[PDB]
Amino acid sequence: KKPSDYGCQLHYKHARVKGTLITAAELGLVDKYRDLKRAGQDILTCDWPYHYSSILYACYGNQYKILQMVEREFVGSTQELTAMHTTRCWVGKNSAMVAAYQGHLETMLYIIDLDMQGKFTEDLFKQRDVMGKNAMMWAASQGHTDTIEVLLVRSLYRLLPEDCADPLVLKTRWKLVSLLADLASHCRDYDPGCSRSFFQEVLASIKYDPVAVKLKDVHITVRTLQGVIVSAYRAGMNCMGVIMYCQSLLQQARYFDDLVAQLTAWEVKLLDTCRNKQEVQAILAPTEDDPSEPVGYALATFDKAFLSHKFVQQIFTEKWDTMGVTDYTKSLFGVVWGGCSLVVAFAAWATICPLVVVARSFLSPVQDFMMRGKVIVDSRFPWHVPLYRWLLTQCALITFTVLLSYLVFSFDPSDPVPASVAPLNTFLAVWCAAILVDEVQEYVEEGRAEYMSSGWNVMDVTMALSYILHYILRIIAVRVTDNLNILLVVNDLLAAAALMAWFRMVSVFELSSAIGPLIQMMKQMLIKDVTRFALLVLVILLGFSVGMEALFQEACIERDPTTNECTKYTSWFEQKRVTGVIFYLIFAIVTAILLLNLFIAMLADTYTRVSTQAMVEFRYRKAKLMASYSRRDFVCPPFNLLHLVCAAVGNGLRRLVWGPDGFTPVSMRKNETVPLFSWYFPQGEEMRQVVVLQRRVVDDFLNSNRVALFREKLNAELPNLVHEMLKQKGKGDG
Amino acid sequence: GFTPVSMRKNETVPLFSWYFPQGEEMRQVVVLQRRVVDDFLNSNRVALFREKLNAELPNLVHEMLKQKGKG
């Protein structure tokens, strides 16, 4: 009969009812692949436009069967098998990418089982391709959520050490591998005789005898991460670092944002289980035993929740500013006495800083003197205070924009030839040369990630590169060639470089808390909201500009022979034309109102999003800054260039004269032969007191999770416990 | 057979390729939907009751003392 009311609303509406090893690999014929390989022609016959072997079609079309035949039949060694799986595509995919590039659990579980057993020789899941993608980064990009978990369980298993023998680090290795062996549990091998499960040889070599399932039992849940954070700590690892590492595994997966928010809430719960500073720097410190620093990993992976805590902003402040000079602004005595000492000691800086850089490269009693300080760090040895190194940088920054705006307010139409070079116009070309040297050894030494995600390094290139290009193209446009329109490009390169300098000079407000989260906003509603609304307006404005030309074009018909009279009303008795241009320009003004209304509501969205995080972004941009200057030398970019020249000369001398001398002024900023803090690697009987004080903190953290995971085990059965206390009430029994 | 249809929007094929299982896929999907939605329906029975026990919390405590009144 007719269906239900639900019937005709939800039910499905419509009515329904070859010679190569490659095409025997993709279809999955085992024996046809075995016969034709006994004639052969290769085992890596690769087709042309995409560089796929006969292996990478089994990984493509989900045949673990004939990948397993080759591993049984046609292989000699470990080194021969890995040459087959690491045979890249034309994009660069190995065997493990192609099985994670598209959801093929049954092939991915074969490759992982070949990797748990140690039958490889390279980390097959850590290799990259042309785009730098990964096997874990392809499965997260495409979104195959069932091969992401299988890659999560492998990286959680591989964290735990196989060498230690503790009964709770061997239980949770058995309960991660058997989460994968029960995940396959079907899909037997190609031989119909000797049949065995996938993770046979891995659960065997683990030494643990265990003395209608739910989806709480076949997935990684929050009680499964807690079994790893304890067992990594019980086996000996930094518990603050295992939480940061397991977090950045789950941010890579993009589909476990309910577990990322828990692991973040444990690195903020462990971080304020501490009381003193002595307990903060006991769990954040590396030792000889675990050399793992978690502070340096958080500001490498931009960890805004850790890196702006009360206790992390306290261990940076007692190195950046141990004297409180940053609070000599909130008083009248502070501005007068702090300001007057600044213009004195910046006048004293610019006259002695060249004389120290020369007399430190070949005047060795000074280089052993300039290393003194830097553990006391305060006003006794003022060149090591990291706040003061920042103040000299901002003073040598405003000096460039005063000496550049004086270069343009002191131009005249008076003398062409002895004004192309000057004591001022050539001095700034050396200055901008030494900003470009500064950005090279910033880029080379840190890397492309922290360079582009920084303060104003991209902007400080362009104001330096366009002034040099102003300086060169003015020299060779007076003498080499005579004169052209090339002289008017010269006035644009100095107009960019004078604009970008004053907008660079609002980095003196990186530390203000009123003018600080206002510059970071105005950067962000200008590099996001305006460069994506200008692409929309360019399509609209080019449509009205075409439509005006179709509205003013002529059609000239009054002639008896050919082409004699022609009606003129172009701009791009006949009182009809102006009527149409008025109505057309009204439709453009309604369009301009409708887009100025969408631009202002676009920006008020961005104000609401960057100001709900005002004092977390600020305390993160501060601590990326307090860590950058604590490793940086006191030579600002105007004397960056003198330091490279005297150290290239002054260390070439002590290769001819005395040999194993050492202590050279190293030709890099951001010194590497310094742990960031002085409370790092604690040799002696301070190691024994940290390890006691760490184990007090972490053991009191791990049983406030074990309490808070017990209350959630009771929230799940709250309507079952209420029914049992109500019956244990004296209806039945007392 | 297989003549070019002049009608666009091919109506024979379903939307996705995983729509109608035919066999062991049908027996596995039934095991997966019972696994998922029986733990959807449990965690609504608990979460509705918690809002009943919030608003009516001094009446459960009063029933535990009312038994001193009767028995």
Partner: peptide, 29 residues
């Protein structure tokens, strides 16, 4: 339902799946 939700559930849905307290509310005052 009082006998199926007597010890955890015999409706296979952890209880009788439409059964709670309603211990009983009073009037008073």
């Amino acid at each position: 339902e009082e006998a199926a939700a007597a010890g955890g559930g015999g409706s296979a849905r952890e209880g009788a799946a439409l059964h709670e307290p309603t211990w009983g509310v009073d009037d008073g005052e």
